[PDB]
């Protein structure tokens, strides 16, 4: 059902528990990221830890009816008890609640001060909300809602299926040595914290940050929601940098963090060059790989641990949030990682990853179309030179020699591709014939606006502006998400967005 046009603000893929939205214009999108009121009437719907969803809002009305004048709701209770310390919160604004038979755990917000914007900051850049699968069953149970989303789901011990799955992709000997956490976030929150807590007693406090990654992740480091120090590194080709920043903090290094290929610039680093540095600094190597997925890089012989967004291409679905933490079993740190890793993080609700245990079956097939598809649409991208300025992606010329030296022999370079364009978003954009929305790693082909989902408030001014350009981005750029449709109509798809 993929390529064709989706009215605006429908939930895609439909599902209750979708986790995109239609945004089919820039016009909406420039509404919808400055929080115009219209637009996000006619689009309430959003990726579900940037907009709450429904069942969620709900459900919180609902408990704190049970004083009865904010309630975030988390997934744990350690999760809000984090929540509350990091916001500057009394501890007693963390509590435990009840409805329909079910415990939920949430933080009180104050209504002055900056308390309730940092405590759904740290919810939102850890991955630690409840989830819709969670709310739905809340509602129903109670008897306020009619019925819940029919789904596909593994239910038989979906947690060992899932890490059984992830430890034959990655190429470790067992899902001892796979933990699945809330969402991706949570799963690079959880090893974040694992290694710091693991480095500390040695004095090693500081952690490097190689290149422009995921907003998230480094929000986790820029707001101090990991209680460390951090150094971005912004060029990821700069290994000489990278040595030169390790120097000037010898000793103190806790960690490297990278991505392969890096959201959204899709930059490839130099995993085996990044081991030898890290070795050298008695750090640990944290490389997220979601874009590039293990089907496609082996990147576990380079790095201590490994993360992955679940909510990706390994389900396919757009419709499920959770993450992957894969130590790697020659690490020096693997024994204290496997000790400590518990204290940080929640798994996903159960019902959350029965629906992932379904839909990891079709992980290695899903790649091997999508990796066909991704190829075929970059040669199409480079035969539209009045159009297309540039196009980032795992086999450019910037970042094929280094994808080569972790790539499977079967490997290909996964479904993304960041297209930079020479004219306004909008004339290749708004009519273009795929699921426009937040999000990526469907079975159906999506785009996103992703300059401004991740950065528009520098959008916005000229120093802002000057700020991405350094960075390596503007307005005018599209973050391609192939799915499995046939290569020849994805191709034509984007060949009629692109002409005049
Ligand atoms: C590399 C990488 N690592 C971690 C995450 C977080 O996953 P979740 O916590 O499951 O949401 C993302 C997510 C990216 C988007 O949501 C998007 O860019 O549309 C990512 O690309
Ligand atoms: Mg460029």
Redesign the pocket.
Known sequence: DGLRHIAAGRPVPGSVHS?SVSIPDVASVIGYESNDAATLSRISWG?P?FRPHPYVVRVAELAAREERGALLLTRSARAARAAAAYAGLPPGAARDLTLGGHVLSGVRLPDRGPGAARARAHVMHT?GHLSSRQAEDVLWDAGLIDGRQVEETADDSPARAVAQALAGAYGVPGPRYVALR???????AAAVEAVTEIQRDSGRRHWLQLGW?????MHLFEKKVVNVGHTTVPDPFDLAEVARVAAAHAGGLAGIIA?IP???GMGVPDLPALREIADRAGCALVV????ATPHNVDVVPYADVV??????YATGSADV???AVVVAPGSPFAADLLTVLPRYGDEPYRRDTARVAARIRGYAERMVRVNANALALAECLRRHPDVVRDTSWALDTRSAANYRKVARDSGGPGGLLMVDLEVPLELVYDRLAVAKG???GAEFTMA?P?VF??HYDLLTTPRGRAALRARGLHRDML?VSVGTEPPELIVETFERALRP
């Open positions: 986790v990726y830890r991955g809330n969402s991706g976030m949570n799963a690079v990654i995921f907003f998230d992740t991505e890096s959201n959204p997220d790989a979601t874009i993360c992955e967004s679940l909510t990706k949030l959770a993450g937040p999000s990526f996103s992703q989902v991740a973050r």
